[PDB]
């Protein structure tokens, strides 16, 4: 089962003769491929919806609301920012000069991804965007400790930065202006943080992709493949999410059930044929 | 000196509503400022303020119309939420105070049980007028549904069985009107006929027990409530007639 015509059809069959469900899955599978992830959520309006997010997008919010830039709706857009992650919580480490001044010497807007930010470090951060020395914003990292740190180094190679660890032979006060990665632009909201394009070699990315391929199977079969493919889609290609619409709450349970059924079937139909 | 509006986040959000209105700056312990370091620019200004035992009022405070409209535009994103009800009550409350004004209706009654009846009839009327305003109105007496049913008569489906589903709906759109008449203890059969014979807004007035123009007689259904009633019932009833089995716990 290959062509998107055939895919939409096997999708439609599992959907109990709903053509919309099949063609929509086909659209997602056509855009993000075999490996793109597709999710089903309860709906707002009465209509089915297919959203496509391309490039790197992960789930976390900005810790301080005052960082908002150009864009309304609390949108923060930063041009060519720099990202570094230390694994640790930053309150007392507020000194961190030599590194900031280096960034101060650069005169660029920063995008900051850390394990977490204490209110103490936050206050002086507010002062920087108001004062104008450097415009800077900071948002929290996506996951749990082991899972996040594994997907953090993945982000480092994307923007060409190097991960600094306090759990490693590297220090919070020690960083260089060159250690940071770059991106074309970044947009941050209450829920999601986004990087459009980072600057990195085609070599490091798929080199990193070839190494994770051995990690795809292992002993673990299905359960880490889920977050791993979750990670994989985010890093190179893109992820797709389908918001399933319904009129009433009881119909939502029926609509969603038919949608997940058809989804698994296309995957099965895709890999093993029909 | 007066206390802040509410418990946290109710209070803190309404300072920024209040702060931008009077053009002052909110002093927070959560940012790089503190109370002992403050400027006269951190202060807001107003023409007059009145405070009584229970109330505080600010008469025409001075802040840009640009900054004020900025806070309302930010609440537009706040208008659409997952909180549904009570979220809408307290959210517009902040907005109304900042731009418009507030209205409160006090329902009177002799006894507490009549109070529950009067206030309930008032809440229905409030939602209805609000809904009527935004989404428009159609002829009451359920005559809208009985009229749209007349317009859809030539409609057909994919198969013969599907046709019945279509016809079942139109017959069922008669129900509301036919029910109102029955509550008057009058022949529903006769009234349905005499209304279906005619067109447009011609309908039955149940209170005056005489026919006439629904719109001219001031009998109005907010279109939203009529649209909603039809949609929701069809969704669940459509699913409901599909039942071939039922599972439950034992007595």
């Amino acid at each position: 089962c290959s062509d998107s015509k055939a895919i939409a059809q096997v999708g439609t069959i599992s959907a109990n003769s709903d053509e919309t469900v099949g063609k929509l899955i086909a659209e997602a599978m056509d855009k993000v491929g075999k490996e793109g992830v597709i999710t089903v959520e309860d709906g707002t309006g009465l209509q089915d919806e297919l959203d496509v997010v391309e490039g790197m997008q992960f789930d976390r919010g900005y810790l301080s609301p005052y960082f908002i830039n150009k864009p309304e709706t609390g949108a923060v857009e930063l041009e060519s920012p720099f990202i570094l992650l230390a694994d640790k919580k930053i309150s007392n480490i507020r000194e961190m000069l030599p590194v900031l001044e280096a960034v101060a010497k650069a005169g660029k807007p920063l995008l900051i991804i850390a394990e977490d930010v204490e209110g103490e470090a936050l206050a002086t951060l507010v002062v920087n965007t108001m004062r104008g020395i450097v415009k800077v914003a900071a948002v929290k990292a996506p996951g749990f400790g082991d899972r996040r740190k594994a997907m953090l180094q993945d982000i480092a190679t994307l923007t060409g930065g190097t991960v600094i660890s306090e759990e490693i032979g590297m220090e919070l006060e020690k960083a260089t202006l060159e250690d940071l990665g770059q991106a074309k632009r970044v947009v941050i909201n209450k829920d999601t943080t986004t990087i459009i394009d980072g600057v990195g070699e085609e070599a490091a990315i798929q080199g990193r992709v070839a190494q994770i391929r051995q990690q795809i199977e292992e002993a673990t079969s299905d359960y880490d493949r889920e977050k791993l493919q979750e990670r994989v889609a985010k890093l190179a290609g893109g992820v797709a999410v389908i918001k399933v619409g319904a009129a009433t709450e009881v119909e939502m349970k029926e609509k969603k059930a038919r949608v997940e059924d058809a989804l698994h079937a296309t995957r099965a139909a895709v890999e093993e044929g029909v | 000196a007066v206390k802040a509006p509410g418990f946290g986040d109710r209070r803190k959000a309404m300072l920024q509503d209040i702060a931008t209105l009077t053009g002052g700056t909110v002093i927070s312990e959560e940012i790089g400022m503190e109370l002992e370091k403050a400027t006269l620019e951190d202060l807001g200004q107003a023409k007059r303020v009145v405070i009584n035992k229970d109330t505080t009022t600010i008469i025409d405070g001075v802040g840009e119309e640009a900054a004020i409209q900025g806070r309302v535009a930010q609440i537009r994103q706040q208008i659409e939420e997952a909180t549904s009800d009570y979220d809408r009550e307290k959210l517009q409350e902040r907005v109304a105070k900042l731009a418009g004004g507030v209205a409160v209706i006090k329902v009177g009654a002799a006894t507490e049980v009549e109070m529950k009846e009067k206030k309930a009839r008032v809440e229905d009327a409030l939602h209805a007028t609000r809904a009527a305003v935004e989404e428009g109105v159609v002829a009451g007496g359920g005559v809208a549904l009985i009229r749209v049913a007349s317009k859809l008569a030539d409609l057909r489906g994919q198969n013969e069985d599907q046709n019945v589903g279509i016809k079942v709906a139109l017959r069922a759109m008669e129900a509301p009107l036919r029910q109102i008449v029955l509550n008057c203890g009058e022949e529903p059969s006769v009234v349905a006929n005499t209304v279906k014979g005619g067109d447009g807004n011609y309908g039955y007035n149940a209170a005056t027990e005489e026919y006439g123009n629904m719109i001219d007689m001031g009998i109005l259904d907010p279109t939203k409530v009529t649209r909603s009633a039809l949609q929701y019932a069809a969704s669940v009833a459509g699913l409901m007639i599909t039942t071939e089995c039922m599972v439950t716990d034992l007595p």
Partner: protein, 96 residues
Amino acid sequence: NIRPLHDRVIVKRKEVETKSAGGIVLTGSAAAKSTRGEVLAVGNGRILENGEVKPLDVKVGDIVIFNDGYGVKSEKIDNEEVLIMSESDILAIVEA
């Protein structure tokens, strides 16, 4: 003006909580207040054993670094906030 006695000097605090001097460093949240000062006026000297009058090594109008204990007391003179301290509380005298 007033004159402190013995070994005690009366100093006017320099700006508080703003670290804005040194490096490229900007202003932070956590506060360290007034580690330096311009003084005002000084005492005659401290007696030691019998030391009688030994002139204090710090002259007047000099800007100095200090460690603030309770030995220094916060007073308000001439609508100005001032610190009274013992000369032993002065660490170093900075000069441009």
